[PDB]
Amino acid sequence: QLLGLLGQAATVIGGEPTVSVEQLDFSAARGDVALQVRAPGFDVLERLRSRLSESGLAVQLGSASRDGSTVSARLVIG
Amino acid sequence: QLLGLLGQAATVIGGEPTVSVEQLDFSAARGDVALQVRAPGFDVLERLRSRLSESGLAVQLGSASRDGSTVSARLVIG
What we know:
The structure is a homodimer.
Chain A: H1 4-14, E1 20-27, E2 33-39, H2 42-54, E3 59-61, E4 65-67, E5 70-77
Antiparallel strand pairs in A: 1-2, 2-5, 3-5, 4-5
C-alpha cells in the first residue's frame, strides 16, 4: 500500500512550505518510507508529524537537532 | 518542486496494479527519483513509462530483464 501512502505524504508535506525533503527511500523488505527532512525549528517538525498522523498515516519522528538556521530529523511513514 | 512529482508518479503507477515498487530512492544531490519496479512483462513497463510521460513527467526506463514470472527494471523520474 506504499503508493497511496507516498502520494498522501507528499501532499501533506507540501502543506508545510518550510519543510525540505533532502532524501527519501523505501524498500519492500524494510516495509516503510524513510525521509530526511529539514525545517526552521522543532515546532514545525512536530506540526508536520501531527498533520501526517491526522491524515491517517502511521508516522514516527526521529530525533532532531539544530545546525545553524535549520533543524533536521528522519521521518518514518508506515 | 518534486513533492508533486512523487505524488503524481504514485498516482500514475497506482493505475498499473500489476506493477510493484520494490525500492524507491530520492536524493536532492542527485536531483531525480529512482524506482526499482517489477511487472508481469515488458509491455506493462512500457505502458507505465508512456503513462508517466503522458502525465507530464520526465521518465527514463532502464534496461529490463525477466526472472521467472516477472520482469524488473529501474525507472528514473524527474
